[PDB]
C-alpha cells in the first residue's frame, strides 16, 4: 500500500501482568497454599468486648435473673413492667427472697424471654376466708418482711382455711400468662399452722388444661433461714377461656397476669459491658461487625450476624497468581 521503504527494522512487543513483592497465601481446590496478589478475610474473629446499645433494646439485668425480675424479688423491683429486645443476664446475679424452685425453669425463662415484656396487670381476685399478703423474713422488702411482688401468699384466717374456688375469664383478645405456685412446708406442724388441712392441694385449670400439684413436706437445706420451698408454675389463658384456681391449702396465688406478645426478643448470658454505639450483631463477647460472611467469635448470637464457623481464617483471593521477579 505504501511505497518501498529505505529503512528496515523490527520492534518487540511483550505482554505481561503485574506482581507484588508482598502477596498472600490462599487455599485452592488443587493446592492449599498458593500465593496470590491480594486476598480478603471472610472470618470475623474479634469483638470490641462491648455490647452496643443500638439498634436493639438491650436491658441489662444487673444483679437480677429474668425469672426473679418476673416474680418480683424485692431487689429486682426496678424491672417492673420493663421491656427488651435482648435481656442480658449477668453471672453475678443473685436471688434474695423466699427459696423457690421452678420445675422446667428453662421453658419459663424461654417463653418470658421471648415475649419480651414484663407488663403486669393486677386483677381483682377475691380470696374469702384466708389471710392475704403473707410475707417472710427471707424476702425483706425494705425494712419489712415481705414476699415476691407478683405473688400473694395465702394463709388461714383465724382458725381455718376454706376450699378456695375462684375464676377469672379472659375476656380480652390476647393471651394472659399467669404465674402461681405452691408452698412445700418443712414440717407437718408448719403445714397445719398455716393451712390447717394436713395435706393441701392446688388445681389450676382452664377449658383446655389442668394442673394439680400436691405439696411435699420435709426438711430441705437451710437457705436464708428457711427449709421450706415454694415451686413456681405457669398457665397461659387464651382469649375467651377461663382460669379457675381451686385449693384447700398451700396456694401461692397470682395477683393478675403478665401479658404475652410475639416479637424478636431473647435473653443472653454475658458479662460484657453495654456501651453506646451501634452494632447489629451481638455475641456474649460483645458486638462484632457483620461485614464478613462468617465469624469465629462465638456460636451464640443475636441479630444480623455472620455464620459461626470452626475456622478462624478463610481468605478469598481477590487477585491473580503472584509470580514475582527476584522476590522483594
Amino acid at each position: 500500500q505504501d511505497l518501498p521503504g529505505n529503512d528496515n527494522s523490527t520492534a518487540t512487543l511483550c505482554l505481561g501482568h503485574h506482581a507484588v513483592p508482598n502477596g498472600t497465601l490462599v487455599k485452592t481446590i488443587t493446592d492449599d497454599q498458593i500465593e496470590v496478589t491480594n486476598a480478603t478475610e471472610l472470618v470475623q474473629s474479634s469483638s470490641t468486648g462491648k455490647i452496643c446499645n443500638n439498634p436493639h433494646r438491650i436491658l441489662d439485668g444487673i444483679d437480677c435473673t429474668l425469672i426473679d425480675a418476673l416474680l418480683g424479688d424485692p431487689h429486682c423491683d426496678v424491672f417492673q413492667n420493663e421491656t427488651w429486645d435482648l435481656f442480658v443476664e449477668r453471672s453475678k446475679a443473685f436471688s434474695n427472697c423466699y427459696p423457690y424452685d421452678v420445675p422446667d425453669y428453662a421453658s419459663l425463662r424461654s417463653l418470658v424471654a421471648s415475649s419480651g415484656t414484663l407488663e403486669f396487670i393486677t386483677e381483682g381476685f377475691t380470696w374469702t376466708g384466708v389471710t392475704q399478703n403473707g410475707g417472710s423474713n427471707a424476702c425483706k422488702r425494705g425494712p419489712g418482711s415481705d414476699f415476691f411482688s407478683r405473688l400473694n401468699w395465702l394463709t388461714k384466717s383465724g382458725s381455718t382455711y376454706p376450699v378456695l374456688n375462684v375464676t377469672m375469664p379472659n375476656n380480652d383478645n390476647f393471651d394472659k400468662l399467669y404465674i402461681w405456685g405452691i408452698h412445700h412446708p418443712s414440717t407437718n406442724q408448719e403445714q397445719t399452722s398455716l393451712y390447717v388441712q394436713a395435706s393441701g392441694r392446688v388445681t389450676v385449670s382452664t377449658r383446655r388444661s389442668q394442673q394439680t400439684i400436691i405439696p411435699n413436706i420435709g426438711s430441705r437445706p437451710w437457705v436464708r433461714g428457711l427449709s421450706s420451698r415454694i415451686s413456681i408454675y405457669w398457665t397461659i389463658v387464651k382469649p375467651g377461656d377461663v382460669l379457675v384456681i381451686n385449693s384447700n391449702g398451700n396456694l401461692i396465688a397470682p395477683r393478675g397476669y403478665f401479658k404475652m406478645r410475639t416479637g424478636k426478643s431473647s435473653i443472653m448470658r454475658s458479662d460484657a459491658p453495654i456501651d453506646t454505639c451501634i452494632s447489629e450483631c451481638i455475641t456474649p463477647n460483645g458486638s462484632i461487625p457483620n461485614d464478613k460472611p462468617f465469624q469465629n467469635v462465638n456460636k451464640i448470637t443475636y441479630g444480623a450476624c455472620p455464620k459461626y464457623v470452626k475456622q478462624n481464617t478463610l481468605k478469598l483471593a481477590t487477585g491473580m497468581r503472584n509470580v514475582p521477579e527476584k522476590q522483594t
Binding site: 505504501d2 505482554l15 503485574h18 455472620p306
Partner: protein
C-alpha cells in the same frame, strides 16, 4: 492455571507495573517502555468484585434460638441440643471451606484467562506482521515507532499499512 499464560508461557509478572493488572512493554526505534492495559484490567477487576459482593451478600438474622451452653447435667434433651448445634456448625464450616476453595480456584483461572485473551487479541490484530516468540512477546517485522506501538495498544493498528514491509523481511531468504 487452565490457560497457561500466567505462570506459564509468560515466565513471570512485573513488580514494576503499578498502573494496571495486565499491560504491554515495548522496545522500538524511539526507545523502550511499558503501559498498562486498562480494558483487561477492568474485566478482571469487575469479575472479582462481582464474586466478592455475592459472597458478602445478605446476612441472615436470627433472634431467639436454642441454648448453647449448659451448667447442669441433664441427659437426653441436652444431648440433643448439643448435637443439633454441633452438626449445624460442622455443616456450615464445610460450606465455608469448600466455597473459598472453589472461588479461589476460579479466580486464578479467570485471571489466567484474561491474560491469555489479551494475548490472543493482540495476536489477531498484528495479522501477518508479527511472530510469536513464545514467551508472551511478539516480534513485529516492520518499523513500528511509538505511535505505531500505541495503535496496537489502543486497538487501531491497520495491518495492511505494513503488510508488504512486514512480509518481505519476514520471508527474507538468505542466512
Amino acid at each position: 492455571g487452565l490457560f497457561g499464560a500466567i505462570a506459564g508461557f509468560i515466565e513471570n509478572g512485573w513488580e514494576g507495573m503499578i498502573d494496571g493488572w495486565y499491560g504491554f512493554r515495548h522496545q522500538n526505534s524511539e526507545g523502550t517502555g511499558q503501559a498498562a492495559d486498562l480494558k483487561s484490567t477492568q474485566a478482571a477487576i469487575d469479575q472479582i468484585n462481582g464474586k466478592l459482593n455475592r459472597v458478602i451478600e445478605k446476612t441472615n438474622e436470627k433472634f431467639h434460638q436454642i441454648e448453647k451452653e449448659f451448667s447442669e447435667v441433664e441427659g437426653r434433651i441436652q444431648d440433643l441440643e448439643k448435637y443439633v448445634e454441633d452438626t449445624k456448625i460442622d455443616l456450615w464450616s464445610y460450606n465455608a471451606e469448600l466455597l473459598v476453595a472453589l472461588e479461589n480456584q476460579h479466580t486464578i483461572d479467570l485471571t489466567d484467562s484474561e491474560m491469555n485473551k489479551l494475548f490472543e487479541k493482540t495476536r489477531r490484530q498484528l495479522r501477518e506482521n508479527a511472530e510469536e516468540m513464545g514467551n508472551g512477546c511478539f516480534k513485529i517485522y516492520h518499523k513500528c515507532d511509538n505511535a505505531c506501538i500505541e495503535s496496537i495498544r489502543n486497538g487501531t493498528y491497520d495491518h495492511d499499512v505494513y503488510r508488504d514491509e512486514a512480509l518481505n523481511n519476514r520471508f527474507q531468504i538468505k542466512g
